[PDB]
CSV table of C-alpha atoms and ligand atoms in Angstrom, one decimal:
chain,number,residue,atom,x,y,z
D,1,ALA,CA,27.3,76.9,45.2
D,2,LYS,CA,27.3,73.2,44.2
D,3,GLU,CA,30.6,72.5,45.9
D,4,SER,CA,29.2,74.2,48.9
D,5,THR,CA,26.1,72.1,48.6
D,6,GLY,CA,28.2,68.9,48.1
D,7,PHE,CA,24.7,67.3,47.8
D,8,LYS,CA,24.8,63.7,49.0
D,9,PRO,CA,22.4,61.0,47.9
D,10,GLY,CA,19.7,60.1,50.4
D,11,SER,CA,16.6,58.2,50.8
D,12,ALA,CA,14.5,58.0,47.6
D,13,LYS,CA,11.8,56.3,49.7
D,14,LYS,CA,12.1,59.3,52.1
D,15,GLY,CA,12.2,61.7,49.2
D,16,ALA,CA,9.0,60.1,47.7
D,17,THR,CA,7.1,60.9,50.9
D,18,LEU,CA,8.4,64.5,51.3
D,19,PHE,CA,7.3,65.1,47.7
D,20,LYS,CA,3.8,64.1,48.5
D,21,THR,CA,3.4,66.0,51.8
D,22,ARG,CA,5.1,69.0,50.3
D,23,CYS,CA,5.2,69.6,46.5
D,24,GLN,CA,2.3,67.3,45.4
D,25,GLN,CA,-0.3,70.0,46.5
D,26,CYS,CA,1.1,72.0,43.6
D,27,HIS,CA,3.1,69.8,41.3
D,28,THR,CA,3.2,66.5,39.4
D,29,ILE,CA,6.4,64.8,38.4
D,30,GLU,CA,5.2,62.0,36.2
D,31,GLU,CA,6.1,62.1,32.5
D,32,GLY,CA,3.1,63.6,30.7
D,33,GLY,CA,1.5,64.9,34.0
D,34,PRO,CA,-0.3,68.3,33.7
D,35,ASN,CA,0.6,71.8,35.1
D,36,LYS,CA,-1.4,72.6,38.3
D,37,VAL,CA,-0.6,75.4,40.7
D,38,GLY,CA,3.1,74.8,39.9
D,39,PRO,CA,4.3,73.3,36.6
D,40,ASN,CA,4.8,69.6,35.9
D,41,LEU,CA,8.4,68.7,37.0
D,42,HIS,CA,9.1,65.7,34.7
D,43,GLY,CA,12.4,66.5,33.0
D,44,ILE,CA,13.3,69.2,35.5
D,45,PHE,CA,17.0,68.2,35.8
D,46,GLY,CA,17.5,68.4,32.1
D,47,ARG,CA,16.2,72.0,31.8
D,48,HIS,CA,16.4,75.6,32.7
D,49,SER,CA,13.9,77.5,34.8
D,50,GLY,CA,10.8,78.7,33.0
D,51,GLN,CA,10.3,76.5,30.0
D,52,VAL,CA,7.5,74.0,30.5
D,53,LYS,CA,5.0,75.0,27.7
D,54,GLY,CA,1.6,76.2,28.6
D,55,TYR,CA,2.6,77.3,32.1
D,56,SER,CA,2.6,80.9,33.1
D,57,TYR,CA,5.7,81.8,35.0
D,58,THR,CA,6.7,85.1,36.7
D,59,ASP,CA,9.2,87.2,34.9
D,60,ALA,CA,11.4,86.4,37.9
D,61,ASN,CA,11.8,82.7,37.2
D,62,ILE,CA,12.0,83.2,33.4
D,63,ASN,CA,14.7,85.8,33.9
D,64,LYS,CA,16.5,83.6,36.5
D,65,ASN,CA,17.4,81.1,33.7
D,66,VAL,CA,18.4,78.4,36.2
D,67,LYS,CA,20.0,75.2,34.8
D,68,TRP,CA,18.4,72.9,37.3
D,69,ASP,CA,21.0,70.5,38.6
D,70,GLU,CA,21.0,69.0,42.1
D,71,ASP,CA,23.2,71.7,43.6
D,72,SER,CA,20.9,74.4,42.1
D,73,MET,CA,17.7,72.7,43.4
D,74,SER,CA,19.4,72.4,46.8
D,75,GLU,CA,19.8,76.2,47.3
D,76,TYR,CA,16.4,76.9,45.7
D,77,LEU,CA,14.7,74.6,48.2
D,78,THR,CA,16.2,76.2,51.3
D,79,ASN,CA,14.6,79.5,50.2
D,80,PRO,CA,12.9,79.8,46.8
D,81,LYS,CA,12.1,83.4,47.2
D,82,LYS,CA,15.7,83.9,48.4
D,83,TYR,CA,17.0,82.1,45.3
D,84,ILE,CA,14.4,83.7,43.1
D,85,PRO,CA,13.1,87.1,44.3
D,86,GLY,CA,9.8,87.6,42.6
D,87,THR,CA,8.8,83.9,42.2
D,88,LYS,CA,5.2,83.0,42.9
D,89,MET,CA,6.1,79.6,44.4
D,90,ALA,CA,4.7,79.8,48.0
D,91,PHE,CA,6.6,77.5,50.3
D,92,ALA,CA,8.9,78.4,53.1
D,93,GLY,CA,11.6,76.0,51.8
D,94,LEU,CA,13.4,72.9,53.3
D,95,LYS,CA,15.8,74.1,56.0
D,96,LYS,CA,17.5,70.8,57.0
D,97,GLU,CA,20.1,69.6,54.5
D,98,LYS,CA,19.1,66.0,55.2
D,99,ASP,CA,15.6,66.8,54.0
D,100,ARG,CA,16.7,68.3,50.8
D,101,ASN,CA,19.1,65.4,50.0
D,102,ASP,CA,16.3,62.8,50.4
D,103,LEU,CA,13.9,64.9,48.3
D,104,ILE,CA,16.3,65.6,45.5
D,105,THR,CA,17.2,61.9,45.5
D,106,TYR,CA,13.6,61.0,44.6
D,107,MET,CA,13.2,64.0,42.3
D,108,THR,CA,16.3,63.1,40.4
D,109,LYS,CA,14.9,59.6,39.9
D,110,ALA,CA,11.1,60.3,39.5
D,111,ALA,CA,11.7,63.2,37.2
D,112,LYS,CA,13.7,61.1,34.7
Y,1,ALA,CA,29.6,79.5,40.5
Y,2,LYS,CA,27.0,78.9,37.8
Y,3,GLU,CA,25.3,82.2,38.3
Y,4,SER,CA,28.7,83.9,38.1
Y,5,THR,CA,29.3,81.9,35.0
Y,6,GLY,CA,26.0,82.9,33.5
Y,7,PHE,CA,27.1,80.8,30.6
Y,8,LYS,CA,25.6,82.0,27.3
Y,9,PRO,CA,25.1,79.8,24.2
Y,10,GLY,CA,27.6,80.4,21.5
Y,11,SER,CA,28.7,79.0,18.2
Y,12,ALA,CA,28.5,75.2,18.0
Y,13,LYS,CA,30.3,75.6,14.7
Y,14,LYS,CA,33.0,77.5,16.5
Y,15,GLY,CA,32.9,75.0,19.4
Y,16,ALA,CA,33.3,72.1,17.0
Y,17,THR,CA,36.6,73.6,15.8
Y,18,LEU,CA,38.0,74.5,19.2
Y,19,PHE,CA,37.3,70.8,20.2
Y,20,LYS,CA,39.4,69.6,17.4
Y,21,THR,CA,42.4,71.9,17.8
Y,22,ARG,CA,42.2,71.5,21.6
Y,23,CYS,CA,40.7,68.4,23.2
Y,24,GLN,CA,40.7,66.0,20.3
Y,25,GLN,CA,44.5,65.3,20.8
Y,26,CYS,CA,43.3,63.6,24.0
Y,27,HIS,CA,39.6,63.0,23.9
Y,28,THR,CA,36.7,61.6,21.8
Y,29,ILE,CA,33.1,62.8,22.3
Y,30,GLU,CA,31.3,60.3,20.0
Y,31,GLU,CA,28.9,57.8,21.6
Y,32,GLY,CA,30.9,54.6,21.8
Y,33,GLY,CA,34.2,56.3,21.2
Y,34,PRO,CA,37.2,54.9,23.2
Y,35,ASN,CA,39.3,56.3,26.0
Y,36,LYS,CA,42.6,57.7,24.8
Y,37,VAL,CA,44.9,60.1,26.8
Y,38,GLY,CA,41.7,61.5,28.3
Y,39,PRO,CA,38.4,59.6,28.7
Y,40,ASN,CA,35.6,59.5,26.1
Y,41,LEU,CA,33.3,62.5,26.8
Y,42,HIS,CA,30.0,61.2,25.4
Y,43,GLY,CA,27.5,61.6,28.1
Y,44,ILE,CA,29.6,64.0,30.1
Y,45,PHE,CA,26.8,66.4,31.0
Y,46,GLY,CA,24.8,63.7,32.5
Y,47,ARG,CA,27.5,62.5,34.8
Y,48,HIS,CA,29.9,63.2,37.7
Y,49,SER,CA,33.7,63.4,37.4
Y,50,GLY,CA,35.5,60.1,37.4
Y,51,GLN,CA,33.1,57.4,36.2
Y,52,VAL,CA,33.8,56.4,32.6
Y,53,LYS,CA,34.6,52.6,33.0
Y,54,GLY,CA,38.0,51.3,32.1
Y,55,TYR,CA,39.6,54.8,32.4
Y,56,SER,CA,42.2,55.3,35.1
Y,57,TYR,CA,41.6,58.7,36.8
Y,58,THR,CA,43.7,60.4,39.5
Y,59,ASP,CA,42.3,60.3,43.0
Y,60,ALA,CA,41.9,64.0,42.6
Y,61,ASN,CA,39.2,63.9,39.9
Y,62,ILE,CA,37.5,60.9,41.5
Y,63,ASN,CA,37.4,62.7,44.8
Y,64,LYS,CA,36.3,65.9,43.2
Y,65,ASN,CA,32.8,64.3,42.4
Y,66,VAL,CA,31.9,67.1,40.0
Y,67,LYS,CA,28.3,67.0,38.5
Y,68,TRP,CA,29.3,68.2,35.1
Y,69,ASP,CA,26.9,70.9,34.0
Y,70,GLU,CA,27.8,73.9,31.8
Y,71,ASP,CA,28.6,76.2,34.6
Y,72,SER,CA,30.9,73.5,36.1
Y,73,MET,CA,32.6,72.9,32.8
Y,74,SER,CA,33.1,76.6,32.4
Y,75,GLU,CA,35.2,77.0,35.7
Y,76,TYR,CA,37.0,73.8,35.0
Y,77,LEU,CA,38.1,75.0,31.5
Y,78,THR,CA,39.5,78.3,32.7
Y,79,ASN,CA,41.9,76.3,34.9
Y,80,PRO,CA,41.5,72.5,35.3
Y,81,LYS,CA,44.3,72.2,37.8
Y,82,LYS,CA,42.8,75.2,39.6
Y,83,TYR,CA,39.4,73.5,39.6
Y,84,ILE,CA,41.0,70.1,40.3
Y,85,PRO,CA,44.4,70.2,42.1
Y,86,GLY,CA,46.0,66.9,41.4
Y,87,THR,CA,44.3,66.2,38.0
Y,88,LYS,CA,46.5,64.8,35.2
Y,89,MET,CA,44.7,66.7,32.5
Y,90,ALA,CA,47.5,68.8,30.9
Y,91,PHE,CA,46.1,71.9,29.2
Y,92,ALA,CA,46.5,75.5,30.4
Y,93,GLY,CA,42.7,76.1,30.1
Y,94,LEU,CA,40.5,78.5,28.0
Y,95,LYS,CA,40.9,82.0,29.4
Y,96,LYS,CA,38.4,84.0,27.2
Y,97,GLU,CA,34.8,83.5,28.2
Y,98,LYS,CA,33.7,83.7,24.6
Y,99,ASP,CA,36.0,80.7,23.9
Y,100,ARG,CA,34.4,78.6,26.6
Y,101,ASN,CA,30.9,79.4,25.6
Y,102,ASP,CA,31.4,78.3,22.0
Y,103,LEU,CA,33.1,75.1,23.1
Y,104,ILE,CA,30.6,74.2,25.7
Y,105,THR,CA,27.9,74.8,23.1
Y,106,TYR,CA,29.3,72.1,20.9
Y,107,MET,CA,30.1,69.8,23.7
Y,108,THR,CA,26.6,70.1,25.1
Y,109,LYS,CA,25.3,69.1,21.7
Y,110,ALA,CA,28.0,66.6,20.5
Y,111,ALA,CA,28.1,64.8,23.9
Y,112,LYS,CA,24.4,64.1,23.9
A,1,LIG,C1,2.2,75.5,45.8
A,1,LIG,C2,1.8,76.4,47.0
A,1,LIG,C3,3.6,75.0,45.7
A,1,LIG,C4,4.3,74.0,46.4
A,1,LIG,C5,3.8,73.2,47.6
A,1,LIG,C6,5.6,73.9,45.8
A,1,LIG,N1,5.7,74.7,44.7
A,1,LIG,FE1,7.1,74.6,43.3
A,1,LIG,N2,6.2,76.1,42.2
A,1,LIG,C7,5.0,76.7,42.5
A,1,LIG,C8,4.9,77.9,41.7
A,1,LIG,C9,3.7,78.9,41.8
A,1,LIG,C10,5.9,77.9,40.8
A,1,LIG,C11,6.3,78.9,39.7
A,1,LIG,C12,6.9,80.1,40.3
A,1,LIG,C13,7.0,81.2,39.3
A,1,LIG,O1,7.5,82.2,39.8
A,1,LIG,O2,6.7,81.0,38.1
A,1,LIG,C14,6.8,76.8,41.2
A,1,LIG,C15,8.0,76.5,40.5
A,1,LIG,C16,8.8,75.4,40.9
A,1,LIG,C17,10.1,75.1,40.3
A,1,LIG,C18,10.7,75.9,39.0
A,1,LIG,C19,10.3,75.2,37.7
A,1,LIG,C20,10.8,75.7,36.4
A,1,LIG,O3,10.3,75.1,35.3
A,1,LIG,O4,11.5,76.7,36.3
A,1,LIG,C21,10.6,74.1,40.9
A,1,LIG,C22,11.9,73.4,40.6
A,1,LIG,C23,9.7,73.7,42.0
A,1,LIG,N3,8.6,74.6,41.9
A,1,LIG,C24,9.8,72.6,42.8
A,1,LIG,C25,9.1,72.4,44.0
A,1,LIG,C26,9.3,71.3,45.0
A,1,LIG,C27,10.3,70.2,44.7
A,1,LIG,C28,8.4,71.4,45.9
A,1,LIG,C29,8.2,70.7,47.2
A,1,LIG,C30,9.1,70.9,48.4
A,1,LIG,C31,7.6,72.6,45.6
A,1,LIG,N4,8.1,73.2,44.4
A,1,LIG,C32,6.6,73.1,46.3
A,1,LIG,C33,4.2,76.4,43.6
A,1,LIG,C34,4.5,75.4,44.6
A,2,LIG,C1,45.7,65.8,26.8
A,2,LIG,C2,47.0,66.5,27.0
A,2,LIG,C3,44.4,66.6,27.1
A,2,LIG,C4,43.7,67.5,26.4
A,2,LIG,C5,44.2,68.4,25.2
A,2,LIG,C6,42.5,67.8,27.1
A,2,LIG,N1,42.3,67.0,28.2
A,2,LIG,FE1,40.7,66.6,29.2
A,2,LIG,N2,41.5,65.1,30.3
A,2,LIG,C7,42.9,64.7,30.1
A,2,LIG,C8,43.2,63.8,31.3
A,2,LIG,C9,44.6,63.2,31.5
A,2,LIG,C10,42.1,63.7,32.0
A,2,LIG,C11,41.9,63.0,33.3
A,2,LIG,C12,42.5,63.8,34.5
A,2,LIG,C13,42.5,63.0,35.7
A,2,LIG,O1,43.0,63.6,36.7
A,2,LIG,O2,42.0,61.8,35.7
A,2,LIG,C14,41.1,64.6,31.4
A,2,LIG,C15,39.8,64.7,32.0
A,2,LIG,C16,38.8,65.6,31.4
A,2,LIG,C17,37.5,65.8,32.0
A,2,LIG,C18,36.9,65.1,33.2
A,2,LIG,C19,36.1,63.8,32.9
A,2,LIG,C20,35.5,63.0,33.9
A,2,LIG,O3,34.9,61.9,33.5
A,2,LIG,O4,35.5,63.3,35.1
A,2,LIG,C21,36.9,66.7,31.2
A,2,LIG,C22,35.5,67.3,31.3
A,2,LIG,C23,37.8,67.1,30.1
A,2,LIG,N3,39.0,66.3,30.3
A,2,LIG,C24,37.5,67.9,29.1
A,2,LIG,C25,38.4,68.4,28.2
A,2,LIG,C26,38.2,69.4,27.1
A,2,LIG,C27,36.7,69.9,26.8
A,2,LIG,C28,39.3,69.7,26.5
A,2,LIG,C29,39.7,70.7,25.3
A,2,LIG,C30,39.8,72.1,25.7
A,2,LIG,C31,40.3,68.9,27.2
A,2,LIG,N4,39.8,68.2,28.2
A,2,LIG,C32,41.7,68.9,26.8
A,2,LIG,C33,43.7,65.2,29.1
A,2,LIG,C34,43.5,66.2,28.2
């Protein structure tokens, strides 16, 4: 629910730091970075869920076929399991809206 | 409602022809095409509503701030006025789902 989301741009600075303290443990975002616990996120926005080559996803994520946009990412980050029952991503999610906007700001930039 | 949409790839061939008999009257999709009744659509997918330079949009579309994805485009095409009360785009919309998938297929390709 994109509209619902109505995602607003935030602090890319801020996003940068939430990435490190929260997604870096398991993911890279750099162009040409490798998979790790989670898959490399470079190019995420221009792609559906479950397609980075050489990464083994759950049927759940593959089947989910999400077209990752910022409204999409926003739901998913509040509760990944909730957005994708069966996913193996282990993280409670980002509950504050502000948090998610900052992050997605960075992501949107870093991942391009 | 992307999920709802669950947009499936269709016939780009088919999409090509529905573009001509239906959107070409008012739009171009080619990279570097000009505005006309409607704005040039090249790059649509990577953009929000109301940002092609030199085109005069209604406050309605500007204000709508749509992040054009394929799920987005799908709602909009069933009833643009419905998706954007106030818009000046004059077209009843594409009622059959099949129609919309074909079109969006092309669009997604042509507009890149
Ligand atoms: C390790 C404990 C993780 C942390 C911290 C974060 N994520 Fe993750 N991510 C992890 C796994 C195991 C998986 C795959 C799940 C599966 O079921 O296959 C993922 C997947 C993602 C995805 C989907 C990618 C796709 O190509 O479909 C996204 C968009 C994602 N992860 C983003 C993300 C962000 C932004 C994080 C920080 C808040 C984050 N994840 C944390 C494991 C882990
Ligand atoms: C002329 C009678 C039109 C035809 C046929 C189609 N569209 Fe159109 N389009 C038209 C106008 C006057 C406008 C702007 C409306 C406003 O309120 O400003 C538009 C706008 C669009 C948009 C939004 C673009 C943006 O940058 O925000 C899209 C995505 C769009 N039109 C697509 C589209 C397609 C795919 C069509 C064929 C089925 C189509 N339109 C028909 C005018 C006219």
